[PDB]
Paper text:
Here, we showed three complex structures of 6mA demethylase C. elegans NMAD-1A, a canonical isoform of NMAD-1 (F09F7.7). C. elegans NMAD-1A protein has 291 residues involving an N-terminal extension (NTE), a nucleotide-recognition lid (NRL), a DSBH domain, and the CTD.
At first, we obtained a structure of the WT construct NMAD-1A (residues 21–263) missing the CTD at the resolution of 2.7 Å after extensive screening of protein constructs and crystallization trials. Additionally, the Met-188 of NMAD-1A took a significant conformational change in the presence of SO42− and was very conserved among sequence alignments of NMAD-1A orthologs. The CTD-deleted construct NMAD-1A1-263 decreased the demethylation activity sharply. To obtain a structure with a typical active site’s conformation, we used full-length NMAD-1A or certain NMAD-1A constructs containing the CTD for additional crystal screening. However, all experiments to obtain crystals suitable for X-ray diffraction failed.
Numbering used by the authors: 33 to 122, 140 to 262
Write the structure that this text describes.
Amino acid sequence: DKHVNYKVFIYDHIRQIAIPTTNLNSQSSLEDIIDESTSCQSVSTDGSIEIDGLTLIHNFLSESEESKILNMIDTVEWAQSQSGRRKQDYGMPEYADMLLNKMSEYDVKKLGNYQPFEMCNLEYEEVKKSAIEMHQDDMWIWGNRLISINLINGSVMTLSNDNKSFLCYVHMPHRSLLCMADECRYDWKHGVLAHHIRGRRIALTMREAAKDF
């Protein structure tokens, strides 16, 4: 753990702020996150922070929508990625248009006007011990908003801030959408630890370019 002596926060999806907690650590179990995530509303705002650009929307997809998408996903072949992951590189998929619209309908200001260069499905699997390390995309090549939709199972998106030694867990439930922009995009690195994966999960990624080139 690089985050062993970090200050750990939990994201309150209702108040849309990160509360510090002593009940979590850098090696917290997936259950610990969920219990703290649902119990942090009554906790004090003392020491809390606001992470501008972090947008979690519960139940972004319905079960019909998800089922339709998952069936279309599995027709296409899976490539090999790193750290026990697989991928499908796309823009091309028919279900992209739908997702872009729903994103605009919920919020035209933030999630509208979105033309991503890449749309990528990232398959996780508990048995492979799939994961993605803490990292950040360069602002000179990659743009503002990073979308991620939780298919099959939810998980936890771990955020870090090295300059301030802040660790933050965002519980992403089944069929939730996480948009990462602004501060969250540019001042925080993001990752998903192996012990936060429940069975199989497919993260439906999107990302826009910084420039047309």
